[PDB]
Amino acid sequence: GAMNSSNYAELFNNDIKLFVDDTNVYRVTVHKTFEGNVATKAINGCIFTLNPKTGHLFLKIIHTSVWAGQKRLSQLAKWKTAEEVSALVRSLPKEEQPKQIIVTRKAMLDPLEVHMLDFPNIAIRPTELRLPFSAAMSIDKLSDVVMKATEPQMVLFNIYDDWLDRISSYTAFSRLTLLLRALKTNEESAKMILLSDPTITIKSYHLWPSFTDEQWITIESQMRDLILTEYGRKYNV
Amino acid sequence: MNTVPFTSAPIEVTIGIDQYSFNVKENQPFHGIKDIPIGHVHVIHFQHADNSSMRYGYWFDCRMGNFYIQYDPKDGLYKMMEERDGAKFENIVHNFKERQMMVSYPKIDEDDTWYNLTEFVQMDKIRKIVRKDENQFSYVDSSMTTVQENELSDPAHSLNYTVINFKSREAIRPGHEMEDFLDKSYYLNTVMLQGIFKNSSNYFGELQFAFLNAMFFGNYGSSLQWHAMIELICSSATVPKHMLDKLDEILYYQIKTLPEQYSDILLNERVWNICLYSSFQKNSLHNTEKIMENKYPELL
Ligand SMILES: CONC(=O)COc1ccc(C)cc1OC
Ligand SMILES: CONC(=O)COc1ccc(C)cc1OC
């Protein structure tokens, strides 16, 4: 059924599974019109589809042309997400298709179930976790590829860079969510933390800097302080 | 006018005939019901005084043969049977009538209730939903399950209603996923009306039969089927104008008939609020919305 703190280790077992987050699928800027009314301009977006065990990120870039002439875009976005996830599954060899797909928002359940009726053995599930995947557009290289796209495009990343060489997927995911949580709560501070030391660089084939184990521990502590810091600033504590 | 004689009434029982109920006491001199309007289906139905568990009953049409009721002390229920000896039957009935051992179907002459609840119900269609082909009448009870309930267990004793499932491949065309799920006109008009029911009269007949089973026996699967068939219409953007007018009339008389005390379990809050206030047809059921708001404003 739903995914929560009790069955959190299921994410890292050997049953193939994907998280789907649709929060950056339909993105807009709101602005005033010459007449003084308000209007939206869409900008490119992405479906965020992640294997939590391997780190494989299937970034489906959503070009603004897919909204042209369409109505009720926030509802269409959910059906377009589901369509694209269904096409991704269908493109994968049977032995690579997920046994479960976990959607980060419950509004995705019915769109995805309907698009996957052909796959009655793939379980579509919600989660009680509050995952910070909306912050994925704060990762510069993922933001850059979405905003540069001139047509629909799928780009494949490993959001864990080479971490699994040294840590488990449980720890890699915990690091990812703590980084994304920090970027979501205070992007400027988070980026400042991540880049303050120019001797630590991001390899061209990576998204995050090349920290040693010890430097990751420091980094992880500073992200926790930031999250705690902002929690105080927010609530006056 | 036609008659359903009873051999006897050995156990105290609540007898339902269509929308009416009356009490017979253990070993009372009761020998049946007379003046039953020819021309409609009917349902006789029972609720034992000593075990209100399992209401049960029989759908029949008096034009299709001479039927009577006889208590069976082994199976412990009032059973419908057919008398094939016509002259025996007329003789039996005439005697009971002369001795005034029969209550009379007391149809008020201003009253079109039963017709309005069974307008599209046909015995032949009932017999396909309730499979037991050696009898001309059809037994139903509170606990019988539906074909769809068994998919989600004795297939001979099932209600074979038409399976409706909005998240099924039958309901959803490849490539039109969002269109067909948010507006179910394809599923209603092409799959169900043209494909399965052939016309809206058979569709309405099943819907009416499902409600009646739902209200008379508290058959839960029947209640699910009734609500499903309403929701399929209300959720279709394109519905023939005459179907909507008829559906409004059908639902109006079902709600009017629905006893006030029985509404908390027979009326699905989600389906009705959706149908009356959110769906495509939210403005097309004036009579039904007016009676629902005045009779059951709690549910809304
Ligand atoms: C318990 O009373 N005898 C029944 O069988 C009652 O079940 C019914 C429910 C609702 C209505 C309008 C009529 C009914 O049949 C008479
Ligand atoms: C209006 O009639 N009064 C009712 O509602 C219930 O009374 C009966 C109804 C039907 C039949 C066959 C017999 C009845 O009592 C013997």
Coordinates of C-alpha atoms and ligand atoms in Angstrom, one line a residue, chain B residues 14-23 45-47 55 215-217 257-259 262 266, ligand 1:
Chain B
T14 CA -42.7 -10.7 7.5
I15 CA -44.1 -11.0 3.9
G16 CA -43.0 -8.4 1.4
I17 CA -44.9 -8.0 -1.9
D18 CA -43.2 -5.3 -4.1
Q19 CA -43.0 -2.1 -1.9
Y20 CA -45.5 -3.4 0.7
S21 CA -44.9 -5.5 3.9
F22 CA -47.4 -7.3 6.3
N23 CA -47.1 -9.8 9.2
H45 CA -40.1 -11.7 -0.2
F46 CA -39.7 -12.9 3.4
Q47 CA -38.1 -12.0 6.7
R55 CA -34.1 -11.8 3.8
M215 CA -33.5 -2.1 -0.9
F216 CA -35.6 -5.3 -0.5
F217 CA -32.8 -7.8 0.6
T257 CA -39.7 4.9 -2.3
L258 CA -36.4 4.6 -0.2
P259 CA -37.6 4.5 3.5
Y262 CA -32.9 2.7 5.4
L266 CA -28.3 2.3 0.9
Ligands
LIG1 C1 -39.2 -5.7 6.8 O1 -40.3 -5.4 6.1 N1 -40.6 -6.2 5.1 C2 -39.6 -6.1 4.0 O2 -39.3 -7.0 3.3 C3 -39.1 -4.6 3.9 O3 -38.1 -4.4 2.9 C4 -38.4 -3.3 2.3 C5 -37.6 -2.2 2.3 C6 -38.1 -1.0 1.7 C7 -39.3 -1.0 1.2 C8 -39.8 0.3 0.7 C9 -40.1 -2.1 1.2 C10 -39.6 -3.3 1.7 O4 -40.2 -4.4 1.4 C11 -41.5 -4.4 1.8

